[PDB]
Amino acid sequence: SFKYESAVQYRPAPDSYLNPCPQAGRIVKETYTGINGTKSLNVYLPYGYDPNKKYNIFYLMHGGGENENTIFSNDVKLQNILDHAIMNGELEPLIVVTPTFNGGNCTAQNFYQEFRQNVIPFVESKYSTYAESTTPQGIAASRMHRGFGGFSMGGLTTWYVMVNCLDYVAYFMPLSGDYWYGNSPQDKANSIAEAINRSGLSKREYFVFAATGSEDIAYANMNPQIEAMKALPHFDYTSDFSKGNFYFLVAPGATHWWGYVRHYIYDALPYFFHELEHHHHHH
């Protein structure tokens, strides 16, 4: 029974959500070959996953020095939080994918190209998303059911995905990372605006839920960028995505550590994928 709030506040998951849930989603290790050579990712399927149904899909990127196994390892345990939240009805069932920017010519900045060409067709040909095909026209037609997020260097990845993939992705979750593209915060905001202009999309067709900690170094460059974005007509600031499309959650006292950042995903992910959803829900 999720309901939108207009200014949602930081709230960690209870400590019991960090322990294994008996209603556990299956995690599948996959290997594929793309423009950056042979690489792996993990796919989280919700408990009761039925491939005759269609699922929203969220792709989630690791930070510097990490890999495609980090988010579901003992150092993070995001699957436990997902399992609990789905079981208790706080979060609608979805597929969550944890890829990597490691390998070949791949960098956090350039990952969007591999994302487009290899990762979406590989994953969404095998698993049941709202994509009816994985041609560019099929991917673009299911964009309201696709999201991208990430932490630190994976937050940087998210910003480059947004500016190059608005045709394919409607929901964005940059966590503790800023957009390195321009010599001022206004250059950053203007580049995002120009990408939106080129896409032809209305303000009801893209959504940005950013977050960091008040004690995370990422705040220093994120906050000026967010302020420059708020001044654009392209963004209506509120966490009530029935009305607007842009929010920045700052967790008091939180440091640059997955121990906190996993809770940002707990807070924000329930806000995604309801606008023009195919179920009859009152939020």
Author numbering: 803 to 1085
Paper passage:
To further illustrate the capabilities of the beamline, several single-wavelength anomalous diffraction (SAD) experimental phasing measurements were carried out on three test proteins. Diffraction data from a single flash-frozen crystal were collected at 100 K using an X-ray beam size of 30 µm2 with a flux of 2.3 × 1011 photons s−1 at the peak of the Zn K absorption edge (λ = 1.282 Å). Next, a seleno­methione-derivative of the feruloyl esterase module of xylanase 10B from Clostridium thermocellum (FAE) was crystallized and cryoprotected as previously described. Diffraction data from a single flash-frozen crystal were collected at 100 K using an X-ray beam size of 30 µm2 with a flux of 3.3 × 1011 photons s−1 at the peak of the Se K absorption edge (λ = 0.9792 Å). All three structures were then refined using the PDB_redo server and model building carried out in Coot. A summary of all crystallographic information is shown in Table 3.
ID30B is an undulator-based high-intensity, energy-tuneable (6.0–20 keV) and variable-focus (20–200 µm in diameter) macromolecular crystallography (MX) beamline at the ESRF. Since its first commissioning experiments, ID30B has proved to be a versatile MX beamline that expands the experimental capabilities of the JSBG beamline portfolio at the ESRF. ESRF beamline ID30B has been in full user operation, including remote access, since June 2015 and, at the time of writing, data collected at the beamline has resulted in 83 PDB depositions and 62 publications.
